[PDB]
Coordinates of C-alpha atoms (C1' of nucleotides) in Angstrom, one line a residue:
Chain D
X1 CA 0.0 0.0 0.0
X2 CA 2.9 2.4 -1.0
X3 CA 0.1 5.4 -2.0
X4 CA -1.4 4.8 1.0
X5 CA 1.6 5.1 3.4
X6 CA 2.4 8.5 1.8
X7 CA -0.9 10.4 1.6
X8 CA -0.3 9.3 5.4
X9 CA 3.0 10.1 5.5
X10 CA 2.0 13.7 4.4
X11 CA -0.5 14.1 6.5
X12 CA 1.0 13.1 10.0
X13 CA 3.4 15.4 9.0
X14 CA 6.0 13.9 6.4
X15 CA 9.7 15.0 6.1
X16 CA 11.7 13.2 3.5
X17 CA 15.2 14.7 4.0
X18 CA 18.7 13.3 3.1
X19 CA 20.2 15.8 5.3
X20 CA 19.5 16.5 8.9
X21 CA 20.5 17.9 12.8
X22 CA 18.5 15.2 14.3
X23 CA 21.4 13.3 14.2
X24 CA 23.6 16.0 16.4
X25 CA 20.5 17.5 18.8
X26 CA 17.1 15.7 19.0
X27 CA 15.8 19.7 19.4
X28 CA 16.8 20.3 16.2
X29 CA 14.1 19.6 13.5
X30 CA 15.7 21.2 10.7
X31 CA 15.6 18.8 7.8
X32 CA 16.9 19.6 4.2
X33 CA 16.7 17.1 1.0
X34 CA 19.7 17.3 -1.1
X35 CA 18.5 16.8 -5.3
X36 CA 22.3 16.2 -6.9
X37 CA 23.3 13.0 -4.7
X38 CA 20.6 10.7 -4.9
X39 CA 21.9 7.7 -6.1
X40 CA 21.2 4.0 -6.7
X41 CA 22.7 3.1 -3.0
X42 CA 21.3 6.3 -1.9
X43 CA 19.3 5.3 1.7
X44 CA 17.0 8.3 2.1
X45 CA 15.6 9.1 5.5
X46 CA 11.8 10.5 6.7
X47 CA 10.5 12.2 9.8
X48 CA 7.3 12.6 11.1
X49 CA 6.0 14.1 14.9
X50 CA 6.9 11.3 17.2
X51 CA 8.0 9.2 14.3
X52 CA 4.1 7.9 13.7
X53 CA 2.8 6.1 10.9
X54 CA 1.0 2.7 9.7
X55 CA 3.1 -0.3 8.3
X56 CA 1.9 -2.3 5.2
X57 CA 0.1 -5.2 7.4
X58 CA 3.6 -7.2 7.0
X59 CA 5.5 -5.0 10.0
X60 CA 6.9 -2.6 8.0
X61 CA 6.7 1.4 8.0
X62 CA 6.9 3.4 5.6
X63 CA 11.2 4.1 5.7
X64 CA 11.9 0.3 5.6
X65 CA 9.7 -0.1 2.7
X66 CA 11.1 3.0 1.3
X67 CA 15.1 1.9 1.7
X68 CA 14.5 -1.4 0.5
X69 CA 15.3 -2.6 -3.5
X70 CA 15.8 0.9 -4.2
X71 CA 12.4 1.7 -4.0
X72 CA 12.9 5.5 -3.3
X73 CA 14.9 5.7 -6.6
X74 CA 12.3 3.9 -8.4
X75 CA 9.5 6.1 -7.3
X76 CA 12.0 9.1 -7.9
X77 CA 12.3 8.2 -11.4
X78 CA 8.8 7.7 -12.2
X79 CA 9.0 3.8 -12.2
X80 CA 5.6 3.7 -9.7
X81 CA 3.6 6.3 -11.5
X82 CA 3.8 10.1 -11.8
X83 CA 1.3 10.4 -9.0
X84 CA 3.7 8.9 -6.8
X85 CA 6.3 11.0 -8.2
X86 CA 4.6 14.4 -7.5
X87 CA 3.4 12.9 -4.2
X88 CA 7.1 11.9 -3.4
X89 CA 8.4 15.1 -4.8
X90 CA 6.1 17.6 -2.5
Chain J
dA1 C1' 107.8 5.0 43.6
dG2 C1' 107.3 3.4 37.9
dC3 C1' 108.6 -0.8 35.3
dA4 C1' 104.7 -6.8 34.4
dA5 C1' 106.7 -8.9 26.6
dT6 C1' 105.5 -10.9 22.4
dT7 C1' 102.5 -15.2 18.4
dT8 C1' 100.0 -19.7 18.4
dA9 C1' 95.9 -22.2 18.6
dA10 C1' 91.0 -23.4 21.9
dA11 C1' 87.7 -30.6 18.8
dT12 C1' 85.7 -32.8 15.4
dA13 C1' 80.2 -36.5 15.9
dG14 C1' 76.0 -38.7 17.8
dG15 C1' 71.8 -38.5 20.5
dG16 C1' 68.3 -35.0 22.5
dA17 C1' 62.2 -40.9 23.9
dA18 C1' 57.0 -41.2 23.6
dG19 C1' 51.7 -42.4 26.4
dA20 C1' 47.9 -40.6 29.4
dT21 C1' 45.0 -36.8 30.7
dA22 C1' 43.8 -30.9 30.7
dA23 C1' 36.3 -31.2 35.3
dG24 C1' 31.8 -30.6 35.8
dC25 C1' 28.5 -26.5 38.5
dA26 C1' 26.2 -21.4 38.8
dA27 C1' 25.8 -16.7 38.8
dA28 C1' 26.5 -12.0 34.4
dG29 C1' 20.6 -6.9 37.7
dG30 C1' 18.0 -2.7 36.8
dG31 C1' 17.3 1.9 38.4
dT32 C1' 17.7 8.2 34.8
dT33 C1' 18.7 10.3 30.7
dG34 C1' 10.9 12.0 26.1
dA35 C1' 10.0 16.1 22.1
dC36 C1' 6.2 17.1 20.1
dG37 C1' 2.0 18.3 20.7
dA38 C1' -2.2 19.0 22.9
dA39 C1' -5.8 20.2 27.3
dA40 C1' -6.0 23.8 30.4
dG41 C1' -5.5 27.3 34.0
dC42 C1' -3.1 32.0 33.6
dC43 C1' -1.4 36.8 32.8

DNA sequence: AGCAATTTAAATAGGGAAGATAAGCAAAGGGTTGACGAAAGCC
């Protein structure tokens, strides 16, 4: 249910970002996404308000799905649709 | 009240033994370190 998870994703609150503080401070939230390095090994990130979401009813949220197979690639490139791709893209 | 000599050669070989074992227990803790966001009194 990878359309679902996202119009989730956005609504909870949805912050794809390659690029973060929330690594250094946890107070941070500042959260940038970086176009000119995604690559094929690229492991994007996501943040939502106190990390919530819904899996795929097989234990698995919306990052793991997203990190796996290069699955964040292929919806970046169009290979799920271009209404995932302007979903993924806002 | 200091003087004490020089060279020369220092053993070749053969042996350093294997057989055994090398414990089984039972323990190895959890206590703090949660931010964002939303009710709800309060200037």
């Amino acid at each position: 249910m990878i359309k679902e998870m996202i119009e989730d994703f956005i609504s909870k609150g949805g912050l794809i970002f390659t690029h973060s503080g929330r690594y250094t401070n946890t107070n941070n939230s500042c959260f940038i996404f970086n176009k000119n390095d995604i690559g094929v090994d690229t492991k994007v990130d996501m943040y939502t308000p106190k990390s919530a979401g819904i899996k795929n009813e097989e234990g698995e949220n919306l990052w793991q799905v997203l990190n796996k197979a290069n699955m964040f690639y292929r919806i970046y490139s169009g290979e799920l649709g271009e209404e995932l791709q302007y979903l993924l893209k806002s």
